[PDB]
Amino acid sequence: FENGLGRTPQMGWNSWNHFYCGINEQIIRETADALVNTGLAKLGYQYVNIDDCWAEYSRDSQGNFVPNRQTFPSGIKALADYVHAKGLKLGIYSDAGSQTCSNKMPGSLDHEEQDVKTFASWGVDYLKYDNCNDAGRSVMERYTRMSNAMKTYGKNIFFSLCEWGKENPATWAGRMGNSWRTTGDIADNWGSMTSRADENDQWAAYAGPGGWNDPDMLEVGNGGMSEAEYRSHFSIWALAKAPLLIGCDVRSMSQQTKNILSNSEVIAVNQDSLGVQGKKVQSDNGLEVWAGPLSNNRKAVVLWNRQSYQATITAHWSNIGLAGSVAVTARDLWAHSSFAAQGQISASVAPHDCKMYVLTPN
Numbered sequence: 001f002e003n004g005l006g007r008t009p010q011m012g013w014n015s016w017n018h019f020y021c022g023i024n025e026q027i028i029r030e031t032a033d034a035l036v037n038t039g040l041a042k043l044g045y046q047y048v049n050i051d052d053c054w055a056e057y058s059r060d061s062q063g064n065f066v067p068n069r070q071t072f073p074s075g076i077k078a079l080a081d082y083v084h085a086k087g088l089k090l091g092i093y094s095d096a097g098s099q100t101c102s103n104k105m106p107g108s109l110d111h112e113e114q115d116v117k118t119f120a121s122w123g124v125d126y127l128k129y130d131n132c133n134d135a136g137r138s139v140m141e142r143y144t145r146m147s148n149a150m151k152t153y154g155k156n157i158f159f160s161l162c163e164w165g166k167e168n169p170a171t172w173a174g175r176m177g178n179s180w181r182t183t184g185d186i187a188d189n190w191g192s193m194t195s196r197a198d199e200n201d202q203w204a205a206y207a208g209p210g211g212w213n214d215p216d217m218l219e220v221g222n223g224g225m226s227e228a229e230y231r232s233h234f235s236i237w238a239l240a241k242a243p244l245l246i247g248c249d250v251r252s253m254s255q256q257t258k259n260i261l262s263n264s265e266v267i268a269v270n271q272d273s274l275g276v277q278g279k280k281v282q283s284d285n286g287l288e289v290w291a292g293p294l295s296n297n298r299k300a301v302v303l304w305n306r307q308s309y310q311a312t313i314t315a316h317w318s319n320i321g322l323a324g325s326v327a328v329t330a331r332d333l334w335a336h337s338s339f340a341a342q343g344q345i346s347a348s349v350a351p352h353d354c355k356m357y358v359l360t361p362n
C-alpha cells in the first residue's frame with residue numbers, strides 16, 4: 001500500500017487480547033499514560049488501538065457511528081486528542097460487514113466513505129477492518145470498497161486488514177492495505193503462538209515496506225505462556241517483520257514482561273530499513289533456525305528450541321545467507337553481548353526458549 005504509512009511494521013497496543021469486549025475510555029487513556037511512563041512509547045510503540053466494542057449498537061439518525069454512550073461517553077475525538085497530546089496515535093476498529101464480530105456494534109459495509117470521513121474528523125490514525133457478517137458478498141468487493149474510501153478520505157490512516165488469511169491475502173492485500181492477518185486468531189498458549197508463526201512463515205516473500213504479513217497481536221504478558229515462550233514469541237514476531245502490537249495490560253506489567261517488550265535491539269530487527277521478513281531456514285526434530293537479511297549486509301538469526309528439553313542448536317552460514325569464509329561480529333540480543341563468529345554459531349538453548357543474534361560482517 002503506497003500511502004507513506006507502514007514503511008516499517010506498526011508498533012503499538014491493542015485492547016483485544018486482554019480486555020476483549022470489556023473496554024472503555026478510561027482504560028484507553030490510562031494505557032496511553034502507561035505507554036509513556038513505562039518508556040514503551042519512546043521505543044516506538046505509538047499506536048493505541050481500540051478493538052471491538054467501542055460503539056453503540058446502532059448508528060444515529062445521520063447514519064454515523066456513535067461512540068458507546070456507556071463506555072466511551074466522552075467520544076472518540078476527545079480520546080484521540082488525549083492520545084495525540086501524549087505524542088501517540090489512536091487506532092479504531094470496524095468490520096467489512098453489517099456488524100463487527102462481537103455483534104455488539106455496526107460494521108462499515110455500504111457506509112465506508114461516511115465512516116472514513118467520520119474517523120478522519122475524529123483524528124483516527126489507524127483502522128483494523130474485520131471480516132464478520134459479510135452479507136454474502138465477496139472478500140474482494142467488501143475490502144475494495146473500504147480501500148477506495150481510505151485512499152480518498154483517510155490518507156493518513158493506517159489500513160490493517162483482518163480477514164484471517166482467507167484467500168491468501170499475502171498475494172493481493174498489499175494493493176489494498178498496509179498489513180493483513182494471515183491466520184485465525186492467536187490465543188495465549190504455546191500451540192496457538194507456534195502455529196501462527198509457522199502458518200505466517202510461508203508468506204515471507206510477499207512482505208516489505210508498506211505491506212506486512214500479520215501473524216496477530218502479541219500475547220506477551222497475559223499469563224498463558226512462560227517467560228521463555230514469550231521471549232521466543234517476541235523474537236520471532238520481530239524477526240518476521242510482524243506488527244508489534246502489545247496485547248497485555250501495560251498498566252500492570254511484571255518486570256519480566258517489560259524486559260521482553262522493551263528490548264530495543266530486538267525491536268531494531270523488526271524495524272530494519274531493508275524491511276525483509278525473516279523466515280524458517282532450518283528445522284531438525286523441533287530445533288529450528290530462523291533468519292533473514294538486514295541493512296548493511298547484516299543478518300538476523302533466531303535459534304528456537306521447540307522441544308521440552310535443553311538442546312544445542314547450530315545455525316550454519318550456508319542456511320542464513322553467508323559464505324563460509326565470512327567472519328562476523330555476533331551480537332546476542334538478549335544477553336546484550338558481542339563475540340566473534342564464522343562458519344556457524346552453536347548454543348545450548350532452553351526448552352521453548354531461544355537465542356537471537358544480529359551478525360555484522362567484518
Ligand SMILES: OC[C@H]1O[C@@H](O)[C@H](O)[C@@H](O)[C@H]1O
Nearest residue numbers: 016051052101102130162185
Ligand atoms: O471481535 C473482535 C475480534 O474479532 C476477530 O474477528 C478478530 O480476528 C480479533 O482479532 C478481534 O478483533
Ligand SMILES: [Pt+2]
Nearest residue numbers: 140144172176
Ligand atoms: Pt484486492
